Amino acid sequence: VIRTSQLIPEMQEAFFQCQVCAHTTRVEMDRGRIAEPSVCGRCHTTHSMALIHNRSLFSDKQMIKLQESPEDMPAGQTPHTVILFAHNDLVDKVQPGDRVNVTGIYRAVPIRVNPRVSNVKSVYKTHIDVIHYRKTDAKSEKRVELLKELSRKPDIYERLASALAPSIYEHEDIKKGILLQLFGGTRKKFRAEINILLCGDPGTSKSQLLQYVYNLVPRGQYTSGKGSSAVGLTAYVMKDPETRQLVLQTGALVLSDNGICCIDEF
Amino acid sequence: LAAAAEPGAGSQHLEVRDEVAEKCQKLFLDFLEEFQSSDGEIKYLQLAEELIRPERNTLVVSFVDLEQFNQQLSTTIQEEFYRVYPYLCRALKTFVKDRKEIPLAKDFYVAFQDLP
Numbered sequence: 001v002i003r004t005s006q007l008i009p010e011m012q013e014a015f016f017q018c019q020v021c022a023h024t025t026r027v028e029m030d031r032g033r034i035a036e037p038s039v040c041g042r043c044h045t046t047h048s049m050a051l052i053h054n055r056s057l058f059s060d061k062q063m064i065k066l067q068e069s070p071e072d073m074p075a076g077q078t079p080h081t082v083i084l085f086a087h088n089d090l091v092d093k094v095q096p097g098d099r100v101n102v103t104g105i106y107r108a109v110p111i112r113v114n115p116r117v118s119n120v121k122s123v124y125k126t127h128i129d130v131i132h133y134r135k136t137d138a139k140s141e142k143r144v145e146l147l148k149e150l151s152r153k154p155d156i157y158e159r160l161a162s163a164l165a166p167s168i169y170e171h172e173d174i175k176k177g178i179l180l181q182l183f184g185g186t187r188k189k190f191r192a193e194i195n196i197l198l199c200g201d202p203g204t205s206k207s208q209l210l211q212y213v214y215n216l217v218p219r220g221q222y223t224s225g226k227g228s229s230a231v232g233l234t235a236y237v238m239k240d241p242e243t244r245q246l247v248l249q250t251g252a253l254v255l256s257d258n259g260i261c262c263i264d265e266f
Numbered sequence: 267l268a269a270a271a272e273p274g275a276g277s278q279h280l281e282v283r284d285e286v287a288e289k290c291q292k293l294f295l296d297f298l299e300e301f302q303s304s305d306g307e308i309k310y311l312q313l314a315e316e317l318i319r320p321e322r323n324t325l326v327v328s329f330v331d332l333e334q335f336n337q338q339l340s341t342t343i344q345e346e347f348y349r350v351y352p353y354l355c356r357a358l359k360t361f362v363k364d365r366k367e368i369p370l371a372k373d374f375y376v377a378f379q380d381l382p
């Protein structure tokens with residue numbers, strides 16, 4: 001998924017009311033159109049029935065733009081994309097960046113040449129009417145008693161520090177400090193967050209250790225100290241491209257409000 | 267004129283009325299008129315005294331106070347809020363006219379705080 005639009009309210013039953021005599025009626029959506037009453041049954045005035053938008057009934061709808069997976073692409077080709085539409089009770093189940101096997105009906109619809117003219121282009125735009133999502137890259141008292149028994153194990157501190165980063169060699173005190181950071185101090189200015197700095201030559205184990213440990217905790221973040229960072233350290237304000245309104249894009253330090261922030265090339 | 271003095275003279279009346287909304291109107295008027303504070307009597311009468319000021323037009327009402335008044339009324343307001351809201355404003359207008367100093371054209375508004 002590349003982008004996921006706002007929740008679109010799509011009408012499913014139009015509520016009409018007479019402006020003269022307050023008589024009300026309800027009409028179903030035929031194929032997206034409305035069969036407007038044209039005359040009020042209780043007072044026979046023509047063109048007196050007015051659509052009350054908020055008394056009408058709406059379902060949820062959302063547009064999702066889906067790009068083919070990188071491994072499926074041909075050699076050196078730019079991605080193809082398809083448009084998905086997900087309706088009520090299946091609407092907000094996917095986020096940008098995730099991977100899915102999506103099942104739906106391959107629709108083809110006409111698109112009007114101009115918003116004020118009913119002529120349609122001969123070439124039909126296509127989209128997927130989504131029926132099912134299956135995410136493919138996202139993945140008790142027994143746990144409590146196992147953890148409680150494990151806490152009494154001899155040299156459990158060394159055991160957990162050794163379990164940290166199996167690919168990395170010999171860095172015992174570094175792993176011990178990282179473990180104490182990941183556990184943290186007692187919350188209650190009484191800052192309980194432990195700050196750790198790794199220092200050494202480029203190409204050494206510290207970058208691998210950061211890239212490992214950031215995904216080992218909830219609420220964690222990883223970012224670069226350089227300007228090429230995907231999520232910057234500083235908060236900033238930008239125009240949200242899909243709607244061109246201001247949005248307060250907070251930085252990684254703020255998004256990791258109760259977790260570890262791994263700052264590489266610090 | 268005869269006892270049949272009404273030819274519908276000048277009438278374009280509402281041939282039907284929203285029953286649920288008008289019941290909500292009268293019951294909310296009763297709530298504003300009868301719900302009382304623990305340290306006194308008739309809280310929202312005292313709070314509605316402030317609406318005679320030129321800038322003030324909104325009465326802030328506690329939804330939990332409405333629940334303490336009646337649960338069915340509170341559920342109906344919560345479920346049918348946008349439908350019934352102008353009727354609640356008319357109820358507030360009927361309640362606040364007893365201060366006697368309001369302009370005739372002044373609108374009044376209800377604002378529900380403390381939603382659980």
Ligand SMILES: [Zn+2]
Pocket residue numbers: 018019020021022023040041042043044045048
């Ligand atoms: Zn009518």
